[PDB]
Design a protein around this ligand. Structure first.
Ligand SMILES: CC(=O)N[C@@H]1[C@@H](O)[C@H](O)[C@@H](CO)O[C@H]1O
Ligand SMILES: CC(=O)N[C@@H]1[C@@H](O)[C@H](O)[C@@H](CO)O[C@H]1O
Ligand SMILES: CC(=O)N[C@@H]1[C@@H](O)[C@H](O)[C@@H](CO)O[C@H]1O
Ligand SMILES: CC(=O)N[C@@H]1[C@@H](O)[C@H](O)[C@@H](CO)O[C@H]1O
Ligand SMILES: CC(=O)N[C@@H]1[C@@H](O)[C@H](O)[C@@H](CO)O[C@H]1O
Ligand SMILES: CC(=O)N[C@@H]1[C@@H](O)[C@H](O)[C@@H](CO)O[C@H]1O
Ligand SMILES: CC(=O)N[C@@H]1[C@@H](O)[C@H](O)[C@@H](CO)O[C@H]1O
Ligand SMILES: CC(=O)N[C@@H]1[C@@H](O)[C@H](O)[C@@H](CO)O[C@H]1O
Ligand SMILES: CC(=O)N[C@@H]1[C@@H](O)[C@H](O)[C@@H](CO)O[C@H]1O
Ligand SMILES: CC(=O)N[C@@H]1[C@@H](O)[C@H](O)[C@@H](CO)O[C@H]1O
Ligand SMILES: CCCCCCCC
Ligand SMILES: CCCCCCCC
Ligand SMILES: CCCCCCCC
Ligand SMILES: CCCCCCCC
Ligand SMILES: CCCCCCCC
Ligand SMILES: CCCCCCCC
Ligand SMILES: CCCCCCCC
Ligand SMILES: CCCCCCCC
Ligand SMILES: CCCCCCCC
Ligand SMILES: CCCCCCCC
Ligand SMILES: CCCCCCCC
Ligand SMILES: CCCCCCCC
Ligand SMILES: CCCCCCCC
Ligand SMILES: CCCCCCCC
Ligand SMILES: CCCCCCCC
Ligand SMILES: CCCCCCCC
Ligand SMILES: CCCCCCCC
Ligand SMILES: CCCCCCCC
Ligand SMILES: CCCCCCCC
Ligand SMILES: CCCCCCCC
Ligand SMILES: NC[C@H](O)CC(=O)O
Ligand SMILES: NC[C@H](O)CC(=O)O
Ligand SMILES: NC[C@H](O)CC(=O)O
Ligand SMILES: NC[C@H](O)CC(=O)O
Ligand SMILES: NC[C@H](O)CC(=O)O
Ligand SMILES: CCCCCC
Ligand SMILES: CCCCCC
Ligand SMILES: CCCCCC
Ligand SMILES: CCCCCC
Ligand SMILES: CCCCCC
Ligand SMILES: CCCCCC
Ligand SMILES: [Cl-]
Lengths: 332, 332, 332, 332, 332
């Protein structure tokens, strides 16, 4: 094998066909798993198989079998091999247990297949201002490092059919949909033009979990705060603790929701809901102070429900309804 | 030794017997420990010994002893060795202190034994919708990377007896049961067919700890909320703070249970329990407002227990009982 | 190629032109992304491309094409290459998947271009005493390790135009502004003088998020504490729980704000706001004790609003206003 | 030196004396520090020096000095060296700054000394059911990987005197006592018999810190709940809030103790204490409801302390005392 | 250069002058930064430059220039170099981007200078029983690994002037003071005597931040608890909730201070303060129960301030004052 190929009779720092046109190289990918997601750092981790095809007649051998052979890794450092890399990546590695996950098959003609197994972490810019009703889209990019479109030609081996995805892929916090591929040509100011391949996909959440954990308790709190309009205004020590305890409860809920968020420092769509229900509860406590002050001054002036109570009984819910209509018209 | 074997007289990039049938290779495993589990990331970590057997007559030597020899590691890179790898793995390594944990024994015939010590992290898809009453099953998969069933034949060396497990294995959060092995043939669209080996096992939790920490306090809270049906309706400042303080207490408990969960964003079987006891406590606070409003309007109209109290005393517990029956009929 | 260049006919431990003047070396940078920031550890992480230019006539070759060639990495360890390093850095590495991200281009003259892809973590001293109204500025420094200004001359290749920045750069907690470059000469007491290059930039926060999360609820709490001046002093069991519950609420808010801060142990500008509103709420609770004690002793002496109430109704808000004026005159 | 020893005249893949009996190899250890402990993962980290002694007459040299020489590391890969490894370990490494921490001394006879500096993480099964009154014992195990008791003989160089421990060893959460060594012979089903060395030690906690942080506040809460037996039963709005606020306080304490525990999911000895004091506080709130209901029905029937109060004043503390006696008789 | 020095004509496994006396080697250090501190693990991280000087006439070359040359790294593995290491260290490394941060300068005589750039984590035993009023001192130790005082002599190159410290060094949680150096001779029982160098320094905190965050709110709580001595004893429903709410508030504060401490399990000087103010608040709640019980029994016996109130008004503060005097006499 090491003899079948005239390894010492050629020069492999030289791309196959240095001189005239660019070498065609064709790519095939199969995704094994998506491993983790960070919302704070804005990135994701994926593990896949990567395959390459090309022809190099320096590697042809005399056999009659019309069938391929096999090598692994050691030969990659003797021969010439392409040099793809992952664009917009934070870290990556190739697996090496119990030996290097690298495969090499060569036919009599010198046609070649070359394959690896890798894990990549790759950046994805996200926007959380519609949280928890956001949708995100991410991508993985592949490019040649050293050779430009004048020396190497990059393309998907079988067009739209060059991506395969494993059956058992899932996340404990997301739903994954819409895998597909595309291409684009890209330019560097000090080095030139290159071809680039993409893999795209889309993410969404489970909205009912967030509904019950956040929107439901605050609504029950705002509804608890309307009870005070139906209690006798003469019962001061039963109308005064109620409001302030309700404020305490709502502040506890809001604090509890703040101590578990992914810690991204700009205003999002649930913060608005929570702070508006805080303001409603606060107004309910101003109301009864108005009523008490007026009843007391009347008592002093002289020496039945109050108008403000029987008006609040109507006004407060209608305005909560009006707020909910507008809010869900804006975030749908 | 390096001379006993004609190392320079052979070619080891070539599998033993390149040409005709596939080489038989036989595997034996002993598990040392399970090291950690992640429920958020859905994976586990294990450490084991791995052993291989095969015959290669390029390694035979003239001795009369009918007994094996020993080498370690350096020789592995001179001779031909198989290339197994762990399928659906996130990371792994071989231990190297104070030197490489690799052993090699060769007999006069050229029969070989080869062994390593490794640690692997490996994915396991879990479903937590029955939490804390869930059960999970995981597995470790082993496969050849480079050679197909037409070049290498993978099998357990002794059938069902090829797995051994250490005596002192345990986790601080789980109970481990049912180790066994099996096999399956698997297919890759761009490379072909391979043999694969499995090791399976099962996990369960301690249910009484979760019972006392979560289900018990909420039940005592719902039972505390029924006390208010037996207090005099004329005692407004002693019936009004009770309910709202009880709501405060229950919200504190629920928040405390949310700040320690493994953070998996979909609805699970304990969330339902907690939110239904929240709704019961909320209804208890609506009840006394009904009673107060009615007594007040009667006082105004004119100028003994109330029916609603003596009806609630019966209705509320029966419905809690009915909820518990249905809930534990569904989750058993 | 390895032959075109007389590799074995020269000595590369020797800088080009050892002897007379210093070699000119010129630098070009393109920033890909800012990856993370730590406020506790005072540092940041960046990923970029780095490019070098120089001439070495040991690498010239006879060709007529007036056009460059290509190599990658392996050649870097055969020839002489500069040795820049990142000053005030905690950690860094060069990417190596699927091979080393290193490029090398040589023209017939022996002019050279050399480029890498790296990730660096680099220290930045920050001062948080104006938090959340702070502004920070950071920088990345580049220097030669081994050769002084008498052997190597470091400069930007194109002056102000030698820095390029990617379009899609962002952080989930900051706004980035004002990239520019400069230079400075620097001195080591036991080794001598060197040239150094800088890249500078500036950071700011989103102030409205911090406003709503911190300053707003405490203000509503201080305003809730003024309600007690308008309730009848004869209603002791409705004036005594109010203050103490309000104290409870404010302490809960402050504790909630302390359990999420970046944990830097010196006094900052929001702590002052929070503790002054604590002191206001505390004084409101001392006030009514004064009023109760005086009314009781008058009752005992003998056997209408009180002056202190109708004075507090004016004094407390004016002093809160006066505090806000001074505070926002100091932090603007 | 490299010449003094006839390196190229011998074969070092071959243990000294391959053939007849087993080589004696003798071990000496000095512990530098214990570095960290994990209670969740059940393991510890230690750093030490390790020393070996043996004789190999392939390394003898003609000198008259009767005194040893020195080498470092590079020679270890030319000559034959033993292959010990740490049994039941999760990770380890040898230090390499500013070069490899390896020492080698050889005398004229061929006697050898060989030493390293390493850090190891090693598993320790713990049982926390007596927490905070638990005691744990851990150990570090040392074994040959490749050679059995028929090829290598492992023993402590000086018996009980072969372990030394540094003066300045401590943990910020434990007290360390009782270092000693021992040996045992161990068996592998597919490879055979080996010798193994042990180092053992013991751990304990500071019990008074846990006492004040956990047992003290709950006791004061249970004692606060007995005050309600001495207040007038006619004071409903002063007897009804007291109990429920006390329940709130105790639930806050318990939640605070749950949010800081090492997160091991089975019942431990402090959980029992906390939940029994919860049940006592709950019964105190049922008591006054009994008293109120009875007084009210008597008032209705007709139209002085109550017996239940003056009985509870005696019964509740005695039963708390009886619980404490039994509890501290069981956990001592 | 590689020729100027007769590399192949000498033996470098042999220290310069093997035989007679010990080689003098002299050390110079410059500290770049202190990077982080762990109070739980008791250690710190530092980054510095390290320099060595010695003479070796195997490296002399014929030149007339009386001036030094330069090499980098590759030569270190051809020639003989010392072998210093950091004593009591947990981890360390040498920086290698964009190449190895190693410098080598040789003069015609064979005098040598050798320098590196490293980061070290190093243990420091701390005692927190005076927290937050503690002071700590730490050190970094440097020693030869392989050679004893009979083969190598270690000393500071310029005495007290051999340490330089960067201008821009700081921590976000500490103040750093008092850098200085010293030396000591040290002994190993199985290997012998060595020289060791030290760098020492001192740390302190910001005490006013801890004062406002911890001591201030508890004091205001103890002062709030004295208000109850001035309210009318006839106002039961206004004297009974006050105490218990105050207890709730103080327990919340203490829990909040426990959920952010560096988690070191022994009693410290702030714990005492907090638990004594807890006991004061608890006694204030026992007091009014005494007063109520006595007034009630007098009412029953028959059918103005109470003595206990007008005595407590004096006794409680004086004892708080007396506690503060003693406490701050003990911790100063
Ligand atoms: C597997 C395959 O495609 N084999 C082809 C065969 O079909 C064809 O007949 C031959 C030309 O003689 O080239 C080869
Ligand atoms: C997303 C995607 O894969 N799109 C293309 C589609 O637009 C095109 O019309 C078709 C045939 O060319 O192949 C596929
Ligand atoms: C250990 C073992 O199995 N040894 C066998 C022996 O039993 C047999 O007699 C011999 C053939 O001569 O081959 C070998
Ligand atoms: C789980 C497992 O190990 N199962 C097999 C069993 O099904 C089979 O009948 C037996 C003999 O073939 O060996 C074993
Ligand atoms: C790309 C480029 O600058 N090429 C130049 C060319 O313009 C010039 O005519 C020649 C001298 O003959 O040197 C080369
Ligand atoms: C920040 C910066 O880039 N400044 C310089 C500017 O001061 C100078 O006047 C100009 C031309 O020399 O180039 C640019
Ligand atoms: C250090 C040591 O033990 N040296 C011994 C010496 O005591 C003895 O006299 C000699 C035999 O001639 O062997 C050697
Ligand atoms: C724990 C330990 O070190 N024990 C042994 C002891 O049992 C033995 O009697 C003595 C002398 O043999 O040496 C020591
Ligand atoms: C830089 C330096 O110290 N150079 C000295 C020089 O002063 C002295 O005159 C000479 C002896 O001829 O040795 C060299
Ligand atoms: C801490 C320190 O650096 N101390 C020494 C000092 O004690 C000594 O007297 C002086 C001159 O020898 O040099 C310096
Ligand atoms: C499935 C639970 C839905 C809760 C909706 C609450 C809207 C305020
Ligand atoms: C919001 C509570 C209103 C209760 C009205 C009851 C009328 C029967
Ligand atoms: C960007 C608008 C924020 C509005 C916040 C309102 C809070 C009551
Ligand atoms: C928000 C309710 C206002 C009610 C005003 C009533 C004036 C008589
Ligand atoms: C062993 C404790 C069981 C608690 C059961 C509580 C069910 C509500
Ligand atoms: C739920 C408390 C009921 C108390 C009834 C007592 C009858 C003696
Ligand atoms: C998927 C059904 C959720 C029901 C939640 C009910 C909460 C009261
Ligand atoms: C859920 C209790 C309802 C009671 C209704 C009573 C109507 C008289
Ligand atoms: C957009 C919200 C602003 C809130 C300002 C609060 C100032 C106390
Ligand atoms: C701070 C509340 C004052 C209420 C006054 C109402 C006058 C109509
Ligand atoms: C450095 C001045 C701090 C002032 C704190 C005041 C808290 C009421
Ligand atoms: C801070 C308010 C003081 C009011 C004093 C009134 C004296 C009659
Ligand atoms: C040193 C404090 C001891 C506290 C004991 C509390 C027992 C309930
Ligand atoms: C294993 C016995 C648990 C008992 C728990 C009792 C809680 C009141
Ligand atoms: C636990 C106290 C029970 C008291 C019963 C009294 C019956 C008259
Ligand atoms: C600068 C604030 C000092 C606070 C001292 C509090 C002492 C109890
Ligand atoms: C601790 C509050 C005492 C108030 C006394 C007021 C005397 C005018
Ligand atoms: C070591 C003495 C501890 C004293 C604790 C006192 C708590 C009230
Ligand atoms: C538990 C408080 C009892 C108080 C009794 C006081 C008798 C003088
Ligand atoms: C701690 C205050 C004690 C007061 C005792 C008064 C006895 C008449
Ligand atoms: N295709 C990668 C670029 O050529 C690298 C660079 O920007 O230098
Ligand atoms: N058995 C592993 C596969 O052959 C690797 C790949 O998918 O290329
Ligand atoms: N330019 C880096 C310095 O020369 C290194 C050192 O301080 O020794
Ligand atoms: N002594 C280590 C064992 O021989 C390794 C294995 O189990 O194969
Ligand atoms: N100076 C380091 C010691 O010689 C190493 C050891 O203890 O063996
Ligand atoms: C917040 C409600 C105020 C009503 C004044 C009449
Ligand atoms: C929630 C109970 C309402 C009862 C109305 C009669
Ligand atoms: C804190 C207010 C005190 C007023 C005394 C007249
Ligand atoms: C929980 C105490 C009940 C007493 C009934 C007489
Ligand atoms: C705790 C104070 C008790 C006073 C008894 C007279
Ligand atoms: C009324 C006496 C108060 C004393 C405070 C020290
Ligand atoms: Cl009342």
């Amino acid at each position: 094998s090491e003899q079948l190929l005239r390894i010492d009779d050629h020069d492999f720092s030289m791309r196959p066909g240095f001189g005239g046109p660019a070498i065609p190289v064709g790519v095939d990918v199969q995704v094994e798993s998506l491993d983790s997601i960070s919302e704070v750092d804005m990135d994701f981790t994926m593990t896949l198989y990567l395959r390459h095809y090309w022809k190099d007649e320096r590697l042809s051998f005399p056999s009659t079998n019309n069938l391929s052979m096999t090598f692994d890794g050691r030969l990659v450092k003797k021969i010439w091999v392409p040099d793809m890399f992952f664009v917009h990546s934070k870290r990556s590695f190739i697996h090496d247990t119990t030996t290097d996950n690298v495969m090499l098959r060569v036919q009599p003609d010198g046609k070649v297949l070359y394959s690896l197994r890798v894990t990549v972490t790759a950046m994805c810019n996200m926007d959380f201002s519609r949280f928890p009703l956001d949708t995100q889209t991410c991508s993985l990019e592949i490019e040649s490092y050293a050779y430009t479109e004048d020396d190497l030609m990059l393309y998907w081996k079988k067009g739209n059919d060059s991506l395969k995805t494993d059956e058992r892929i899932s996340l404990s916090q997301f739903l994954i949909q819409e895998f597909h591929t595309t291409t684009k040509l890209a330019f560097y100011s000090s080095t030139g033009w290159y071809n680039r391949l993409y893999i795209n996909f889309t993410l969404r959440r489970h909205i009912f979990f967030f509904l019950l954990q956040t929107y439901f308790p605050a609504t029950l709190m705002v509804m608890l705060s309307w009870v005070s309009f139906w209690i006798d205004r003469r019962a001061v020590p039963a109308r005064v603790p109620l409001g302030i305890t309700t404020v305490l409860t709502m502040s506890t809920i809001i604090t509890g929701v703040n101590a578990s968020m992914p810690r991204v420092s700009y205003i999002k769509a649930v913060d608005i809901y929570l702070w508006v229900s805080f303001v409603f509860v606060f107004l309910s406590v101003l109301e009864y102070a108005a009523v008490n002050y007026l009843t007391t001054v009347q008592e002093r002036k002289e020496q039945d429900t109050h108008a403000i109570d029987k008006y609040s009984r109507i006004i407060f819910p209608a305005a909560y309804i009006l707020f909910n209509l507008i809010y869900w018209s804006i975030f749908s």
